[PDB]
């Protein structure tokens, strides 16, 4: 299939500023009929995609003047002259030159604010869960910006990969930060084999990871 | 205006069947090719199926060919998607979309419906296990509740019966061992907890459950 590649994955903007988003196709989108069937959609949470631009540079009915599109061959750009709050959402490029029609992975238009390191808290398995035979260790990484962040779990100082569930909030409406929950689920038996539990958060706000730990035997 | 309204979604067992419908209005249905497009959470749209205005041409994505069938009845302004041998990865929001044309080519999906949701799972209704996330093992303390192993969505977690919300983070549920898991955090000044009680309340309507979990330190 034709691969549609969008950059960036996430674009932070301040209201009233200009925004440009890029889309590259793996194959030329010029049709035999001479058209270039490259389109742009906007999708807001809970709604379906809405068409914004079709055939590279045509604005769809009702789409405001601040949206424009350009490009040729394999490289396309969507431009917003001055970003309004209603423009926030996920933008998709799409091609219909070749069967099957395909879509890019999306570029999320988000809000810029000052950087902020996460507040990190770690929690041991509850006695209630241990009675059921399981042992979830939970790390909250709260109120950080920008969204990109990584968590590393260590058990007795050694990294662990199996059993991790990471879940992000959307951008907060009150302070424009993100938060995320990282859960390492073990069996009771595995938890009782080791004593030192650590989550390490790496974020652009520091080259040093944020390290939070507890010792099982003290809980 | 052009309007498309999908119906027929729901919860289906793996290997099961489902027939979606799409009711079209505000244009001459018989003049337009039609399509189905699906979207899994966090993912882009994925085209599923196409049928031309007189149904001379039908196309399917490779991921559904041999299992899905698209059809239409122009006199009833309705498009259909018959789904068979359903698989977990078919879980998605399913959109009906119109193809526009100027001459001989259907070239853009211009109007989309709001979607009908299809979930493929063998899970049975299961109440959550609610586990306190307790600190102990500055002037602020973060507490949480882990809400594990429930089905279906959704659940509602409130803190002190909703009196605490400004500092609450609700983390979206994810699948874990065929059931959903979510968590919720709250941050309170140290002068309040543990001196005053902090409780998470978890409501899971499908299982007729509401459980309160009082937070106790390590």
């Amino acid at each position: 299939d034709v691969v549609m590649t969008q950059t960036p994955l996430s674009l932070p903007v301040s209201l009233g500023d200009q925004a440009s988003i890029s889309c590259r196709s793996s194959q030329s989108l010029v049709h035999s009929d001479g058209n270039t069937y490259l389109h742009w959609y906007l999708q807001k949470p809970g709604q379906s995609p809405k068409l914004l631009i079709y055939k590279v540079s045509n604005r769809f009915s009702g789409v405001p003047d601040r949206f424009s599109g350009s490009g040729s061959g394999t490289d396309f750009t969507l431009k917003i002259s001055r970003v309004e709050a209603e423009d926030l959402g996920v933008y998709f490029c799409s091609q219909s030159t070749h069967v099957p029609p395909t879509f890019g992975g999306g570029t999320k238009l988000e809000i810029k604010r000052a950087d902020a390191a996460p507040t990190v808290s770690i929690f041991p398995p509850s006695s209630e869960q241990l009675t059921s035979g399981g042992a979830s260790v939970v790390c909250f990484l709260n109120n950080f910006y920008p969204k990109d962040i990584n968590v590393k779990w260590k058990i007795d100082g050694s990294e662990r990969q199996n059993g991790v569930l990471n879940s992000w909030t959307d951008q907060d409406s009150k302070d424009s930060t993100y938060s995320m929950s990282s859960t390492l689920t073990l069996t009771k038996d595995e938890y009782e084999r080791h004593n030192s539990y650590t989550c390490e958060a790496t974020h652009k706000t520091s080259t040093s990871p944020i390290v939070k730990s507890f010792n099982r035997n003290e809980c | 205006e052009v309007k498309l309204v999908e119906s027929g979604g729901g919860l289906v067992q793996p290997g099961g069947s489902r027939k979606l419908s799409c009711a079209a209005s505000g244009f001459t249905f018989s003049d337009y090719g039609m399509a189905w497009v699906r979207q899994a959470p966090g993912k882009g749209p994925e085209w599923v199926a196409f049928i031309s205005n007189l149904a001379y041409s039908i196309y399917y994505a490779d991921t559904v060919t041999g299992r899905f069938t698209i059809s239409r009845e122009n006199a009833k302004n309705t498009l259909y998607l018959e789904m068979s041998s359903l698989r977990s990865e078919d879980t998605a929001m399913y959109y009906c979309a119109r193809y526009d044309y100027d001459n001989i080519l259907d070239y853009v999906m211009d109007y989309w419906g709001q979607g009908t949701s299809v979930t493929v799972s063998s899970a049975k209704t299961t109440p959550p296990s609610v586990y306190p996330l307790a600190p102990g093992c500055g002037s602020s303390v973060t507490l949480g509740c882990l809400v594990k192993g429930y089905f279906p969505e959704s659940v509602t977690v409130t803190w002190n019966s909703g009196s605490l919300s400004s500092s609450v983070h609700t983390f979206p549920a994810l699948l874990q061992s065929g059931l959903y898991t979510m968590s919720s955090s709250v941050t309170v000044p140290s002068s309040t907890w543990p001196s005053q009680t902090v409780t998470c309340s978890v409501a899971h309507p499908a299982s007729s459950t509401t459980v309160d979990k009082k937070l106790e330190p390590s």
Partner: peptide
Amino acid sequence: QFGHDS
């Protein structure tokens, strides 16, 4: 990308 029916 699909053919229209005239």
